[PDB]
Amino acid sequence: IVGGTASVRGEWPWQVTLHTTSPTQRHLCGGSIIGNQWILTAAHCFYGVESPKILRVYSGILNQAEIAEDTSFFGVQEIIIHDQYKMAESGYDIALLKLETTVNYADSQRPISLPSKGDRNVIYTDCWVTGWGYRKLRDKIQNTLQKAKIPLVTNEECQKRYRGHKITHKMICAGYREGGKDACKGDSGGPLSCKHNEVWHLVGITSWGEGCAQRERPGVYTNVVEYVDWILEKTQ
Amino acid sequence: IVGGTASVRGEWPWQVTLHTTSPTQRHLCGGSIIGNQWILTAAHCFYGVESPKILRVYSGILNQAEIAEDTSFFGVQEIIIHDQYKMAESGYDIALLKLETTVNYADSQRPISLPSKGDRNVIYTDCWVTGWGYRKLRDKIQNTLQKAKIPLVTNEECQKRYRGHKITHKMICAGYREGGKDACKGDSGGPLSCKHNEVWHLVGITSWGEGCAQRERPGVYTNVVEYVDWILEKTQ
Amino acid sequence: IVGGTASVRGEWPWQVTLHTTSPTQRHLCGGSIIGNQWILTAAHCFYGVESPKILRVYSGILNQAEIAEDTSFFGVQEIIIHDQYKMAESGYDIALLKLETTVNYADSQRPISLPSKGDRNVIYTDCWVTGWGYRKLRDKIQNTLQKAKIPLVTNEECQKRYRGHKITHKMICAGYREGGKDACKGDSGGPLSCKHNEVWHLVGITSWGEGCAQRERPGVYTNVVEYVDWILEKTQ
Numbered sequence: 012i013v014g015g016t017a018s019v020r021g022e023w024p025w026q027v028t029l030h031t032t033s034p035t036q037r038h039l040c041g042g043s044i045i046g047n048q049w050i051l052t053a054a055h056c057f058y059g060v061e062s063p064k065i066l067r068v069y070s071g072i073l074n075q076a077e078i079a080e081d082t083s084f085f086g087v088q089e090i091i092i093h094d095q096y097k098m099a100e101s102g103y104d105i106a107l108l109k110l111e112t113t114v115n116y117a118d119s120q121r122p123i124s125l126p127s128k129g130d131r132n133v134i135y136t137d138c139w140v141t142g143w144g145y146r147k148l149r150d151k152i153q154n155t156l157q158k159a160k161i162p163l164v165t166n167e168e169c170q171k172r173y174r175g176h177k178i179t180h181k182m183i184c185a186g187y188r189e190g191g192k193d194a195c196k197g198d199s200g201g202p203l204s205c206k207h208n209e210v211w212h213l214v215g216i217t218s219w220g221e222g223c224a225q226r227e228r229p230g231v232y233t234n235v236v237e238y239v240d241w242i243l244e245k246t247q
Numbered sequence: 248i249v250g251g252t253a254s255v256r257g258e259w260p261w262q263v264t265l266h267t268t269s270p271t272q273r274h275l276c277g278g279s280i281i282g283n284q285w286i287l288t289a290a291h292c293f294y295g296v297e298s299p300k301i302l303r304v305y306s307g308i309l310n311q312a313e314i315a316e317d318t319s320f321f322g323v324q325e326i327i328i329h330d331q332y333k334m335a336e337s338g339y340d341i342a343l344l345k346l347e348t349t350v351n352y353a354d355s356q357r358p359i360s361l362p363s364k365g366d367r368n369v370i371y372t373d374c375w376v377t378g379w380g381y382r383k384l385r386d387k388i389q390n391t392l393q394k395a396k397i398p399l400v401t402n403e404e405c406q407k408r409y410r411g412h413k414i415t416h417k418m419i420c421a422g423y424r425e426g427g428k429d430a431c432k433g434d435s436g437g438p439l440s441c442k443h444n445e446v447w448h449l450v451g452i453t454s455w456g457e458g459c460a461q462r463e464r465p466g467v468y469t470n471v472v473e474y475v476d477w478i479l480e481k482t483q
Numbered sequence: 484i485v486g487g488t489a490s491v492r493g494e495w496p497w498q499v500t501l502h503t504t505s506p507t508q509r510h511l512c513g514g515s516i517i518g519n520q521w522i523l524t525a526a527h528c529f530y531g532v533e534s535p536k537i538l539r540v541y542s543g544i545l546n547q548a549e550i551a552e553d554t555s556f557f558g559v560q561e562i563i564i565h566d567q568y569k570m571a572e573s574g575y576d577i578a579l580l581k582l583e584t585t586v587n588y589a590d591s592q593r594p595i596s597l598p599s600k601g602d603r604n605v606i607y608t609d610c611w612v613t614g615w616g617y618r619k620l621r622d623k624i625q626n627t628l629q630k631a632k633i634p635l636v637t638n639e640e641c642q643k644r645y646r647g648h649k650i651t652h653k654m655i656c657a658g659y660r661e662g663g664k665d666a667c668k669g670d671s672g673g674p675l676s677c678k679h680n681e682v683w684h685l686v687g688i689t690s691w692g693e694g695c696a697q698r699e700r701p702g703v704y705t706n707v708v709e710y711v712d713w714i715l716e717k718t719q
């Protein structure tokens with residue numbers, strides 16, 4: 012996260028860190044708890060992942076230093092990628108992880124609500140991006156989960172900033188005209204969380220951008236409300 | 248209907264009683280007129296129904312005692328069940344009956360309007376459940392069509408009351424925290440009718456609940472607005 | 484267009500005239516620029532069109548007399564018709580033309596924005612129908628692009644006027660109770676353009692009606708917001 016600050020332990024209790032054990036164990040990408048056997052994340056995270064067996068999901072984590080050989084985790088029973096995904100920039104960047112066991116909900120780990128089809132015209136004013144990603148384009152994975160408040164921008168606006176891409180209605184964009192705050196490498200698959208009517212909604216999945224936090228380059232996120240049918244179908 | 252009252256003749260002119268003639272003729276479930284050859288009802292009503300030939304649809308009925316051997320009815324040309332239905336509790340509990348002849352609309356029999364996709368955020372405050380079902384869990388089919396006003400509850404609220412089920416965005420729930428008014432056995436397939444802007448909309452199809460009218464157990468209804476594409480496709 | 488007036492050059496810069504070169508060149512129908520290789524139009528326009536090779540798309544046109552042998556045009560690489568279209572009156576009257584080259588946007592030719600799924604409850608009050616069609620049922624193609632302001636009517640209202648048709652939620656209707664202003668022969672495939680919040684949206688595609696501009700016979704238009712998924716899918 013560029014231009015963010017350290018989170019308070021458990022203020023983002025749906026946020027997970029997904030690790031790979033190959034070749035030695037490391038953070039791979041963010042994700043969100045949406046059901047007690049279910050993590051919502053980005054399809055692109057699974058490039059060159061041949062098996063769910065090398066994946067570990069850690070919940071209730073603030074600092075990456077909490078994770079050691081003796082730390083408990085959830086195994087992944089199945090990776091489910093949207094059947095129309097090709098790459099982050101052309102959309103459908105969405106995947107589900109079916110956990111081998113179920114998450115016991117608690118103050119340190121609990122699900123985030125999905126937005127509802129009838130909220131397509133809601134104006135979110137309290138949206139945050141979170142993760143353990145780089146603090147600039149050339150950096151390293153951060154120990155402490157970072158947060159940053161970022162305003163939504165309309166698709167018409169986002170499209171003007173990405174003339175060489177098609178910004179579709181299945182994407183949503185967030186950023187400062189002058190940049191300075193954004194996701195970056197290591198944040199993808201994580202949530203864009205917006206509080207509305209005292210409740211937090213999973214509005215976006217962190218997906219792609221041109222560099223990190225650059226002026227006139229909003230972050231691009233998978234527009235979660237567009238996939239609620241798909242989520243329902245697959246989580247059966 | 249638990250805790251309801253007798254309806255006035257024709258105040259629910261889209262409400263039908265669907266009968267089976269096997270082994271002797273009896274009420275099977277409720278339904279709603281949505282087009283002049285078309286009844287909207289619940290898929291689960293057709294468990295063990297091998298043929299449309301044993302089905303009779305009665306319209307303009309207030310009292311089950313109006314129905315006798317010489318009473319006219321509409322035969323069913325075809326039963327159409329949603330192809331993803333398995334059982335009431337996992338959703339898609341929706342079916343269409345194509346009538347052999349067309350209904351002549353009149354004050355005693357006429358169609359109810361379907362809700363529109365752009366009403367997903369409407370707040371219905373005037374909703375009623377109707378049918379000839381039991382007045383409690385252990386009872387019998389009632390002679391006179393009963394009605395009851397029941398408030399909608401949000402899906403988040405409904406979900407808390409049904410911890411062992413998945414209450415999906417394709418369901419909608421209605422009930423009193425303290426219970427006392429609800430559908431019951433014999434009511435299913437019938438409408439949940441809500442009046443908005445001087446017009447009645449078919450918001451729900453009566454589907455399932457844990458017992459009838461129990462405290463903290465709202466009734467669960469198929470969320471009709473979610474199926475308008477499906478209704479359009481099939482009624483061609 | 485019945486009861487309309489001459490347009491100002493370039494006030495409808497997304498409007499195109501689609502011509503056929505067989506047997507001698509003539510106007511065939513209207514269309515709208517929605518992307519720089521993409522025209523949105525009506526499926527029915529392509530009845531008996533065996534090949535894209537005989538199609539020419541002209542942009543930046545006010546008067547049909549601008550079109551001559553030496554006038555530049557865009558060839559069509561591909562005709563894409565909705566796979567569920569059978570005929571205008573049963574709906575799905577929508578088609579895309581993939582142009583052989585890309586349109587250079589300018590003040591005389593530029594794309595119109597598609598409505599968004601979250602605008603299904605917007606109340607459009609500033610809607611216009613445009614084209615080079617007949618000024619009455621028995622007439623000829625007009626030289627100068629005509630315009631007419633026409634109010635939207637609800638589907639319930641439209642349905643009452645077309646008792647022998649099914650007016651679906653994928654259609655939208657516009658007209659005066661007393662008639663007098665409407666599309667007519669030669670206008671189809673063209674836009675119904677509504678200005679909302681200082682922006683123009685492509686709300687309808689001119690599709691069908693009973694005669695032209697008759698009292699109690701609104702024009703019927705393909706309801707574009709219902710096809711945004713389809714447009715996205717096909718324009719890949």
Ligand SMILES: COC(=O)Nc1ccc(-c2nc(CNC(=O)CCc3cc(Cl)ccc3N3C=NNN3)[nH]c2Cl)cc1
Pocket residue numbers: 037038039040144152193194195196197198199200217218219220221222223224229230231232
């Ligand atoms: C010790 O373990 C490790 O080192 N782990 C580790 C794990 C993963 C990665 C990694 N993940 C990605 C995928 N992209 C993202 O995460 C953010 C995409 C993104 C989204 C928005 Cl909204 C805005 C901007 C950007 N954006 C553009 N440029 N950069 N970011 N790339 C790399 Cl590299 C690196 C190191």
Ligand SMILES: COC(=O)Nc1ccc(-c2nc(CNC(=O)CCc3cc(Cl)ccc3N3C=NNN3)[nH]c2Cl)cc1
Pocket residue numbers: 273274275276380388429430431432433434435436453454455456457458459460465466467468
């Ligand atoms: C002489 O002819 C006859 O005797 N006819 C006859 C025909 C049908 C049936 C019959 N129909 C059903 C299916 N369920 C429903 O109708 C209501 C479901 C329901 C929905 C909501 Cl929202 C809330 C609660 C409930 N709920 C839970 N418990 N009970 N009800 N079960 C039986 Cl049994 C019985 C007798």
Ligand SMILES: COC(=O)Nc1ccc(-c2nc(CNC(=O)CCc3cc(Cl)ccc3N3C=NNN3)[nH]c2Cl)cc1
Pocket residue numbers: 509510511512616624665666667668669670671672689690691692693694695696701702703704
């Ligand atoms: C020199 O080149 C030429 O002569 N070119 C040329 C090209 C095309 C046509 C032509 N196109 C059509 C298809 N229908 C429409 O265009 C409008 C449909 C429509 C829509 C609404 Cl909303 C309301 C009313 C109507 N409506 C009903 N009755 N009439 N119109 N029919 C014919 Cl004929 C004629 C001549």
